[PDB]
A paper describes a structure:
[name] displays two forms of fimbriae on its surface, FimA and [name], both of which are crucial for attachment to other bacteria in the oral biofilm and to the host cells. In the work presented herein we have determined the crystal structures of the shaft protein [name], in both mature and precursor forms, the anchor protein Mfa2 and a truncated precursor form of the tip protein, Mfa3. The resulting mature protein thereby has an empty position in the first β-sheet that a β-strand donated from another fimbrial protein presumably fills in order to polymerize the individual proteins into a polymeric fimbria.
In order to investigate the importance of the C-terminus in terms of folding and solubility an additional construct was designed and crystallized, pMfa1Δ9, where instead the N-terminal extension was present but the final nine residues at the C-terminus were removed. pMfa1Δ9 folds into two domains, the N- and C-domain which together form an elongated structure of approximate dimensions 100 × 45 × 40 Å. The N-domain (residues 32–236) is comprised of a β-sandwich consisting of one mixed β-sheet and one anti-parallel sheet packed against each other. The C-domain (residues 237–554) also consists of two sheets, one mixed and one anti-parallel. In pMfa1Δ9 the β1-strand is anchored by the side chains of Met37, Met39, Leu41 and Met43. Further, in [name] the N-terminal part of the β1-strand is shielded by a short helix that forms a lid over the sheet. In [name], the β1β2 loop - where the Rgp cleavage site is located - is flexible and has not been modelled. In [name], Trp554 is inserted into a hydrophobic cavity between the N- and C-terminal domains. There it forms a planar π-cation stacking interaction with Arg236 with electrostatic energy −3.68 kcal/mol, as calculated by the CaPTURE program. Arg236 is in turn firmly positioned by hydrogen bonds to Asp71 located at the end of the Nmature region. [name], the shaft protein, possesses an extended C-terminus that, in the crystal structure of the mature protein, partly reaches into the void formed by the missing β1-strand. This C-terminal region, however, had to be removed in order to obtain a precursor form of [name] in which the N-terminal extension is intact.
Residue numbers in the entry: 32 to 43, 70 to 554
The structure:
Amino acid sequence: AAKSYMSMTLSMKDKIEKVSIYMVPQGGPGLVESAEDLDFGTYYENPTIDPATHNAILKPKKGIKVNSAVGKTVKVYVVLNDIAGKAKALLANVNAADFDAKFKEIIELSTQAQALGTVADGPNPATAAGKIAKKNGTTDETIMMTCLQPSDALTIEAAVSEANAIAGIKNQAKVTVERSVARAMVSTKAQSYEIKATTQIGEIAAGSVLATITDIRWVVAQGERRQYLSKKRGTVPENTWVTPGSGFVPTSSTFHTNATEYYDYAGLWEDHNTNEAVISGTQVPTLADYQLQDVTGELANALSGKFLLPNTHKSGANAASSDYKRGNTAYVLVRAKFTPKKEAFIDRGKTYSDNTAVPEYVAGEDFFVGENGQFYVSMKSVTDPKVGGVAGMKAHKYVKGKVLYYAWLNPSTTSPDSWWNSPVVRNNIYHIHIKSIKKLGFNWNPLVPDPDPSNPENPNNPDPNPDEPGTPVPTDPENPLPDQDTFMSVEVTVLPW
Ligand SMILES: [Ca+2]
């Protein structure tokens, strides 16, 4: 039953499962006519490429029935792969007059509670972005897409045959769609790195090998948990496209109480391992692993990277004028095993004040790095002057040698201590390549909200504070992005997806 037919040419490996079309009459209050959750393979041909734009076109092969909208001037909006039902639910019973504004309103992918995981959620936590972006084995990917702007207006003519609509003779419009998530990818020059001392460390002279970093893994966190259904422009040059959390600029205290109102951390538990002797997270491929034809299984999942929801703030040229902070910006967390040479330990071969012998450092065990930069086998050593310790000195405990590094997804400018800004925008790929790991990282991750910040326990953080009270924190959520002295050498590439 149809007063007329219409169709939609769509423009952009991606699998398109579903298509939703919304015909919005112009001019004032009115009735939207929608055809939601159509089976893509029933209504469209397979994607093909155009020489000019070198982009994909999705050509209709079946007509869309029109009834209420016949004779009206409409604009057409499109959602592809609405697989969490979010667009359908947001747009239901929306008047034609309100539809354009509603199409740029917010959808919630993870609740505030869901934005934090625990150990029981690993190794495959539900993430905000994962709910609208799925990898189908190693074959292809199903990703939600929306149009940035609707079709040019057109008048739906009555009595147009399905054949003429499909052929584009009458009642055909054109829409461009873009993916609702961004992709993070990480690679590494080598799977191991040699660390040189830059000063005397125990018996290790400056310039000599201090340690080896092995078993490098990664996770991604602090993308958003909500998003504008389709991209929303800001009002100033410093932030082209705004996100629901753009206005949030944390302080040391408001980070813990308010960060989950905007950001997802469930992904920190991806590929988590409950054995603390083992490094948690996803493997990092070498550049060589991409050239490999026919990969295994868990290497395949690592190569294709991870999804996250957009996250932008007002950009600036310094700490004062940039609203990007460590507590509101998307980050890659790199985890690795740091194995120091036993000779690096200033307490080696010495005797404690209680006349017991200082034990030799055992590879893979905890070690402690004092405020003075020296290495100790225990807290007893750290504070005992007879073994090179210092009374009242604090130290960082590296739990079974676990070290942590941050990489920001879209550093600008580059390269070391001037990347003040890091916008993450949908339908882009952020490729972080590790060229080297240059020194000792951090022993825990303070960029995770702690529901009771007065104590070090935090079940929502796989890398909680292991240190005694009064120990300086490695970093703070209210800090700006750039590192005064780089822990990692990286090159970040951003390209259209
Ligand atoms: Ca706590």
